[PDB]
Amino acid sequence: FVCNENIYMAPNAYTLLATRMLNATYCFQKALTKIEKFPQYNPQEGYTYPKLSN
Amino acid sequence: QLLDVSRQIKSYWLTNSLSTSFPTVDYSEPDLEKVKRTLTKLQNHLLEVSLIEP
């Protein structure tokens, strides 16, 4: 189609729905990987987060 | 979560009452005689005691 002196092919629905699903799940992977190896657990002391100061 | 349970159970096994009061240093059981002679002497310090009699 002529998108105002411009031409774009019509996107497939599944391709972009799955694209956004890709973007989201990728953000989820990144969301998990950043915080893995961080809840310094101890049964005695809960989920400690070690810090420079309180 | 399992260790979280384990700490609970451990806490339950230490919340129970002691069978008995704990042993200590009962060693060198104190004399009664010296205490008496000291108290009686000091109380009679600079005093002219003259026996008892009925």
UniProtKB/Swiss-Prot annotation, chain A:
Q: Which GO terms describe its molecular function?
A: transcription coactivator activity
Q: Where in the cell is it found?
A: Nucleus
Q: Which residues form the signal peptide?
A: none
Q: What is its main location?
A: nucleus
Per the record, the GO terms for biological process are: positive regulation of transcription initiation by RNA polymerase II; regulation of transcription by RNA polymerase II
Q: Which UniProt keywords are present, listed alphabetically?
A: Activator, Nucleus, Transcription, Transcription regulation
Cellular component terms, GO, for this chain's entry?
Answer: core mediator complex; mediator complex
- How is this protein organized at the quaternary level? Component of the Mediator complex.
Q: What does this protein do?
A: Component of the Mediator complex, a coactivator involved in the regulated transcription of nearly all RNA polymerase II-dependent genes. Mediator functions as a bridge to convey information from gene-specific regulatory proteins to the basal RNA polymerase II transcription machinery. Mediator is recruited to promoters by direct interactions with regulatory proteins and serves as a scaffold for the assembly of a functional preinitiation complex with RNA polymerase II and the general transcription factors.
What is the similarity comment for this entry?
Belongs to the Mediator complex subunit 6 family.
List the protein's name. Answer: Mediator of RNA polymerase II transcription subunit 6
Q: Which organism is it from?
A: Schizosaccharomyces pombe (strain 972 / ATCC 24843) (Fission yeast)
Q: Which gene encodes it?
A: med6
Curated annotation (Swiss-Prot), chain B:
**Family note:** Belongs to the Mediator complex subunit 22 family.
Subcellular location(s): the record lists: Nucleus
What job does this protein perform? Component of the Mediator complex, a coactivator involved in the regulated transcription of nearly all RNA polymerase II-dependent genes. Mediator functions as a bridge to convey information from gene-specific regulatory proteins to the basal RNA polymerase II transcription machinery. Mediator is recruited to promoters by direct interactions with regulatory proteins and serves as a scaffold for the assembly of a functional preinitiation complex with RNA polymerase II and the general transcription factors.
Annotated GO biological processes are:
positive regulation of transcription initiation by RNA polymerase II; transcription initiation at RNA polymerase II promoter
Q: Which GO terms describe its molecular function?
A: transcription coactivator activity
**UniProt keyword terms in alphabetical order:** Activator, Nucleus, Transcription, Transcription regulation
**Main site of residence?**
nucleus
Transit peptide as a keyword?
no
Give the quaternary structure. Component of the Mediator complex.
Q: Does the keyword Transcription apply?
A: yes
> This protein is called what?
Mediator of RNA polymerase II transcription subunit 22
GO cellular component, alphabetical, reads: mediator complex; nucleus
Q: Report the source organism.
A: Schizosaccharomyces pombe (strain 972 / ATCC 24843) (Fission yeast)
Gene name, Swiss-Prot/TrEMBL: med22
